[PDB]
Amino acid sequence: SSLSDQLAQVASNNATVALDRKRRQKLHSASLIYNSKTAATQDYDFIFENASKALEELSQIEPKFAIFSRTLFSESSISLDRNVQTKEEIKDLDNAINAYLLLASSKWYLAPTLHATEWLVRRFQIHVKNTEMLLLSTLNYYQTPVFKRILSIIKLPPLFNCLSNFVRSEKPPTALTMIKLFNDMDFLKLYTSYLDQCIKHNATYTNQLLFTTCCFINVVAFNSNNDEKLNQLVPILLEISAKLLASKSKDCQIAAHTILVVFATALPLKKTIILAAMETILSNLDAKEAKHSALLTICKLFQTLKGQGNVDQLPSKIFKLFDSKFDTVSILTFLDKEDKPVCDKFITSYTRSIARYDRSKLNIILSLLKKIRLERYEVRLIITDLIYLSEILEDKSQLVELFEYFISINEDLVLKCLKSLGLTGELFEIR
Amino acid sequence: PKVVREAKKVEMTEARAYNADADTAKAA
Amino acid sequence: VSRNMALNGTLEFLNSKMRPEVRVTSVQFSPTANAFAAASTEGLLIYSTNDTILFDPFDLD
Amino acid sequence: KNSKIFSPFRIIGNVSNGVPFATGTLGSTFYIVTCVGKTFQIYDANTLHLLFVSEKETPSSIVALSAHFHYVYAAYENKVGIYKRGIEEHLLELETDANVEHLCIFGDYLCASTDDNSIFIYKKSDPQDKYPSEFYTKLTVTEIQGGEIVSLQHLATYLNKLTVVTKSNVLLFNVRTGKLVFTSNEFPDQITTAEPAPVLDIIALGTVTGEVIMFNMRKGKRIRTIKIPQSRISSLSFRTDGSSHLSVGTSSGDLIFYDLDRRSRIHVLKNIHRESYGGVTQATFLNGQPIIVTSGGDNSLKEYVFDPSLSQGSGDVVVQPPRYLRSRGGHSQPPSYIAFADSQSHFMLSASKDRSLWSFSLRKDAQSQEMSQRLHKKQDGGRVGGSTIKSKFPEIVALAIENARIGEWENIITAHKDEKFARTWDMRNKRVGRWTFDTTDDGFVKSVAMSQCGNFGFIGSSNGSITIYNMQSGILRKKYKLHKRAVTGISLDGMNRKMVSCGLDGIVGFYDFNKSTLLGKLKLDAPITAMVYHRSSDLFALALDDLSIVVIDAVTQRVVRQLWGHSNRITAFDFSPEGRWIVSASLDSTIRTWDLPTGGCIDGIIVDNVATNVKFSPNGDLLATTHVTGNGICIWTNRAQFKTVSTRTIDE
Amino acid sequence: EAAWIDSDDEKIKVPILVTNKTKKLRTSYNESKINGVHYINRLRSQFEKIYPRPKWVDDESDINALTKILSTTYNYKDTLSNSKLLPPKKLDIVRLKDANASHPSHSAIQSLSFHPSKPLLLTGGYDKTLRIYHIDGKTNHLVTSLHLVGSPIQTCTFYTSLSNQNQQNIFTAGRRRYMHSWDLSLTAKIEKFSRLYGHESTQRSFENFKVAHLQNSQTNSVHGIVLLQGNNGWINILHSTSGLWLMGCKIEGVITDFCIDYQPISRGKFRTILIAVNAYGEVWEFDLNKNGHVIRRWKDQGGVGITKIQVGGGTTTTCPALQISKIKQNRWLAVGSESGFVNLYDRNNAMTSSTPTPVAALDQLTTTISNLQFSPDGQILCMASRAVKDALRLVHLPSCSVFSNWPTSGTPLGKVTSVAFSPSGGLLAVGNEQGKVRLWKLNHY
Amino acid sequence: DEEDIALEFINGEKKDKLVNMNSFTSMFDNIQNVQMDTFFDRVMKVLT
Amino acid sequence: DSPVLQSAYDPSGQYLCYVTVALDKQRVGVQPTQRATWNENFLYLEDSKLKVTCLKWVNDTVAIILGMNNGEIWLYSVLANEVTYKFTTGNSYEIKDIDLMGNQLWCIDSSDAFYQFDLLQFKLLQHFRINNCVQLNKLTIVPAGDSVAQLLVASHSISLIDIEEKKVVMTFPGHVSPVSTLQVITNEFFISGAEGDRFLNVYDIHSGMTKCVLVAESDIKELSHSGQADSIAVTTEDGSLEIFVDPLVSGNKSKKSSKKIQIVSKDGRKVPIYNAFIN
RNA sequence: CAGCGAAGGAUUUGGUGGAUUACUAGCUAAUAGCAAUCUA
């Protein structure tokens, strides 16, 4: 490499040190409130005292900023210089800055957080040192002047490369620019680690979940025509779906439901992946809107399932788990809705799992398959395992009235399954 | 502009390694 | 006439990592024995055949 | 059979054969010693340059080789050879007849496992000398204790102990007291590989079903398990530069990378080597470095490097995938055709059954390069046909290189298996050319030639018709129709004045070339399989079907010698550059040298593989043969370039 | 804590200051020899400071169902044969040897049909010859070849009866007042149909015919019918062995095309329906197992210049049933037009409405629809136009979405003037105006 | 009759909506302070 | 090129079994070689990518063993039209050659493994593999009566194998290309011929010495020998037939063909001969 | 338009790797040590 390249590397290392007055002015005029001519003449005491006022306002709004008043906004930090302590003190205060940023990511619509993080911008130089976490935290606010301001004063990371024509510009970045930003794979790994820290420290708020889910399903939509990009993309977004389903927020759970339903209708996933996805869906299902989205998600994920094995009995563990999260009244009511969801293959798998695993609730399967209409292969498999139920256990009135329903519609088909296995006079002598 | 997948020029570095010649002892 | 890289016009392709140029200024054939001399920059290069090697028959059976 | 003209020099074009190589570290540099059949080769890992080749061929194939600092330990049939700078320093004969097949070196001890599940320990005499030399004891792994020994390792800080990895068990021996310290519990599937982790007292085991176990050799437990379903695990390596990655190597040719800290899967390099030749056979991280050297049984040795992470704050979670770095390689199948590219004996063109044309260097093995098959654009502007999934050209029957106009236009003309056109190539650019010469009679190309003006190429089809194309502009100039069965040899004068063709109907046609007349036609007594024209003396030799070599001159059109003695079909032959000898090779596993002045056989070599190609250098330096097995090119040097040999006939 | 102690290291005793590497693991300047367990601990700490201790060893040893299934799987889609129905938007279609490459055609290939059972492909065009090719992958050879002088052919069809499936007739016809019928016997016995039994004024050219099956419906005796499209609105149906005019069906307008649907009734009884389209867009369905009487009359939604109707998803005339119990009801019906618009109707619900709406109107190729054929499973429709070059699309259905990866810009489709689907192999033949049948295999089948 | 069972299995398949490049581009306009379940049914309306 | 992918006669040359493709699926048919003593029904391979790699007539319900490319030997009776029994190895490797002696079937694998099956017991008796034989594509049982000792296996290089020791007892210099015919002529000789060359060579199975070389004038596709070594008829790539009459006598080291037969029509079109039979 | 025409074609460009001389290994205080270290 060349000498100017190696010197650009040492400039990028020494970016924040003010080595004379002109660099100090150019480096201290980068404010988030004031313009450059006021910001260059301000002091540390002035910006600290009104940032401490704004942190008291932000702390009486949300009381988790008081420990930042203890450490990051204390009065020892007026004289704390960033690039004079070692790497271990640097990583201490940079996870302090990361904690503040992913706590105050939600508060970015109210001016105390602007005047408070003004002091992180001007004392700790987080627009050029801790800049990836700053962009990732305020990414939701991209139509707003506060994201315009941080783009004007930011030094843009190499992963955020497509925002480089919207820095120091008067127009906001557009939604197609946001999808082009999210369309990378390394950016997707970065954003999923950011969400992992959000989910861990319990700071996921609904505007973030909406923006994140919108950009994720637009990434899947953009890559919907190349299977190798979809296959690069599956263990990233299904991993973040698992980590959103493994939390307590109903909003982040149905965000994961949205990601799972778009991804399963974008490409045909494996049967075992779909079953483990419904196990992870049911294993933390506690809300009601989450239950609504969870039933619709499990129905569509079973609908988008092809081949030999789409409508087996779902196994005993996952069927009794689905029973413990959704009883009979819930399933029957949801099928009785006039909007008519498409629940064909899932309801077939459900009734076959009832016939292999319950053997008491057969009047309810008569009522629900009276409600919704199925296909020929669905009802053929249903009456074949009802035939096997008749041959294993003694045939009472619930199985008899089920066969009366399967005689009252499509009696030629039940004749075809009895002639494929058994006989009609022998079956009438059975029951 | 998309992100820049350019490769750096790779040079090897000086690494320390445990050699196992000290893992053998003689009896008196 | 030369593979010396110390002379100039020898290599057609230079390693991507004045000198005396190479040139022949006079050629002549020998008047008595099947050879030629070439006045290069390195000296008088004398190229000659010899019949000790190269089996080259003339209508043997 | 020992010879008296040609003596063996080297076998070029070979990089690996799928013995797991060893890495070694002098100071802060690394070398890579790979086995090529019966020799090993040491490579400089910073640039993959061939430092050393072992001095003598071992009496059998090297089967397990390791490398400490300056010394390389190569185990073949019975014994362990200790080599420094190629030259062998010591030879340790084992007291068994069992084949030694594993070894480790730690401390003063070299431990070599045979295939009858016995282990031979060798000790240094005084701890200041260089290699273990004296016999110490013998260890035995009987059927009660464990299965077949599948690996033999020494994980660090274990004072004179040895981890023996059997197929089901892990034993731990004290090699001074000869004792079995600890035998682990069994493993429910057969373990194939082992690698010691840079974590203290942890080994990593790789099974024949798809799982990597992380055995803790002091607790006796397993720490964790990594499952890669339906994949047999053939390599394990660990990253040691502050990034805890593991690299497993799968015998369908895959290199999978795992993060052990956050339990994710970083990346998969698919088809890094051929499954049919063994998959990835040895993959190892150069320690402290983000570069991993892989090697496979397909005669290939690659390096992959991890670039630093693209996120400036996260890093550990955004791991950029491994990219390719330098690699060396050769043919993965034995070569089918051989030619010398120039008169200096520097490069030689070489085509194989794996459908690649390499250009191998006889001077420096880094200069060996595969001629590229990336086609040019069509001349008019129309589309070119062919499949979208690009594959290599059919394997090369014949070729003819004539570098009179080299760099100017197309230079090599080559003929492929069962296809009706002959491609061209440019040796200067090292790539294909713009022209494919058709035969124009729906017959496959049986021979090619080209003139030494470089203007004309000659195609000889299987329906007996010579077509003469221009190499610069690629168009048909002339078309001679003499033969009716397949034309197997075309050549032309050094003055472009008389051409000579030979077909497998057994007629040699003599044509004038400037005028398009024929000068004559001579009917031999067998179908002719191959012609070689010695161009200065104007004498061409024919390999007839009656197992003779007819030497005939083109000036007066007479059979002037007829050489008898081969017992089976003559595969190849070639003239001496002075045109005094002709060396032939045939399917009776023999190579003969004929002094065509006196007309008799000077020397004979019985060689175990049948030599399919024989070429002299255009100076009298080297003979290059090519055999049925072996991916390389065997190289001989004629001792008659330094002494004078007697032209007195051998027999038997 | 430890699973073994060896009792030899405790009584070993090492030196330290003899080599420079072990010279660093002393704790004093008076230590010269140390015990073995001490020495092992010294170089254990030294190993730990050469290679620092990671977090994966001491961190953990071995709702997570999704994470576990992702950490074990490597492929994430359905594998090979547990699909059974086509994936949309990306085909899987290899190119084989061009079928008539062995023996070239001297004209544009006007019609093209596979055999119902044997591996035979019949091509035929305006050079008044018809050729049969044994097709396979590699070497599509020519079985036989018959040149009818003075009779250019426009439609040629393999007919194979349902009773014994042993006739194997070839019916062929062009712009003539006759139609030939070759009886396949492996000389060649062909007969000529040239009598409309009183109806010659309404049938002046035998070009557009189709062959179908008909049941007597008082016996269970089937026989083949040929159906000729005539001038006014007329379809003249006549026997395929005796040539007797059986019945005729007249639609009101300019008859442009027609197709044959079958529907089963009971064991061994089916019913034949003729579906004929006006130029304007109104469609008649005639029951013709009885007298040729109309049972339904509906109208195509949109569509003003209508060139070609086709059914599919069951037994068409191009996917024919070999056995009478294997006759299926067609699911799909595509009406393709002069603007390139192809309406697509789903006859599992669009037999009742009498102004039925299409499930989709395809618009991808912009000139006149001259072929549209359904694959035998009824999952692909093939739109094709003989007007511009390379105008062929394969639209997946039920999703009604065109495959976007084939044909590409480098497919040698030519000016597509005929197309045919194999009944068993999953295999397209596409004949163009240069005289070339190109051949492709769909790897789903 | 396994061919008849396979034909009825491929016959019982219903028309679905496929994801395009631009099936979800018009959601950024109304992800502003709506609830996440309203986002879920707005997505499900696009998918159906 | 020919549509007939595989073809073989029964012993005595009365029926011909032949595998051809039929619109992407293999089909196996049997024709009588003289009608004076059509057969329109085939065995159909139901998979598009399952194909026959070798076939052998058994000798008495008459049957064919068809070695497939999924580690199976199908056993298919020809009067009926079903595969009567499906031998399988433990693997998915395609099998390169089979043979039988009496009731004892032997077969070679693409992983260079030897399998032995018993036609009387329908069981896998033995499975092994031997060193330095690694590209095998032909085996031939050297006959010694009901003893099935001495296999003869080719990989471009013929090797004689004792099966009691599972080891190689002789090594013949083969060819420069894979061996395509490998057949035992007498109790002391075997002929071999490779892919894409026109040279057969007859080796002495007791010494290793090549007795003679037989030279076709085109690349050899198949060969047949009469049952008493007195004549060998090979059929070549250009559709011709070449008869070597009495090749095992003293044209001393290499012998040309004695007779050459080709077929033309009444037109001038030359049809190709594939797979003749001599007696 | 014709023609060429295998699940696409063309043009332009950034980065890296290998060759561009003929392959005997790293370091040092060098007849040897080290390479985990030269220092008591």
Q: In a nutshell, what does this entry contain?
A:
The structure is cut from a larger assembly and holds seven protein chains of seven kinds. Chain A has 431 residues and is mostly helical. Helix content of chain A is 65%, strand content 0%.
Question: Secondary structure elements and their pairing?
Answer:
This is part of a larger assembly, with 7 protein chains of 7 kinds.
Chain D: E1 6-12, E2 22-26, E3 29-36, E4 39-44, E5 49-53, E6 64-67, E7 71-75, E8 79-84, E9 87-93, E10 100-106, E11 109-114, E12 118-123, E13 134-140, E14 149-153, E15 161-166, E16 170-174, E17 179-183, E18 191-196, E19 202-207, E20 211-216, E21 222-227, E22 233-238, E23 245-250, E24 254-259, E25 265-269, E26 280-285, E27 291-296, E28 300-305, E29 323-329, E30 335-340, E31 347-352, E32 357-361, E33 369-370, E34 396-401, E35 412-416, E36 421-426, E37 431-438, E38 445-450, E39 456-461, E40 466-470, E41 476-480, E42 487-492, E43 498-503, E44 507-512, E45 518-523, E46 528-534, E47 539-544, E48 549-553, E49 559-563, E50 570-575, E51 581-586, E52 590-595, E53 600-606, E54 611-616, E55 622-627, E56 633-638
Antiparallel strand pairs in D: 1-56, 2-3, 3-4, 4-5, 6-7, 7-8, 8-9, 10-11, 11-12, 12-13, 14-15, 15-16, 16-17, 18-19, 19-20, 20-21, 22-23, 23-24, 24-25, 26-27, 27-28, 28-29, 30-31, 31-32, 32-33, 34-35, 35-36, 36-37, 38-39, 39-40, 40-41, 42-43, 43-44, 44-45, 46-47, 47-48, 48-49, 50-51, 51-52, 52-53, ...
Chain E: E1 13-15, E2 33-35, H1 36-50, H2 55-59, H3 65-72, E3 93-95, E4 109-114, E5 120-125, E6 129-134, E7 141-147, E8 155-159, E9 169-173, E10 179-183, E11 190-193, E12 209-215, E13 222-229, E14 234-239, E15 245-250, E16 257-266, E17 269-277, E18 282-287, E19 293-299, E20 306-312, E21 332-337, E22 342-346, E23 360-362, E24 371-374, E25 380-384, E26 392-396, E27 401-402, E28 416-421, E29 427-432, E30 437-442
Antiparallel strand pairs in E: 1-2, 3-30, 4-5, 5-6, 6-7, 8-9, 9-10, 10-11, 12-13, 13-14, 14-15, 16-17, 17-18, 18-19, 20-21, 21-22, 22-23, 24-25, 25-26, 26-27, 28-29, 29-30
Chain G: E1 4-9, E2 15-21, E3 26-32, E4 43-44, E5 52-57, E6 63-68, E7 72-77, E8 83-88, E9 95-101, E10 104-109, E11 114-118, E12 123-128, E13 138-141, E14 151-154, E15 159-162, E16 167-171, E17 179-184, E18 189-194, E19 199-204, E20 210-215, E21 220-225, E22 231-236, E23 241-245, E24 254-255, E25 259-261, E26 263-264, E27 270-271
Chain D binds one RNA strand of 40 nucleotides through strand 2, strand 3, strand 5 and strand 29.
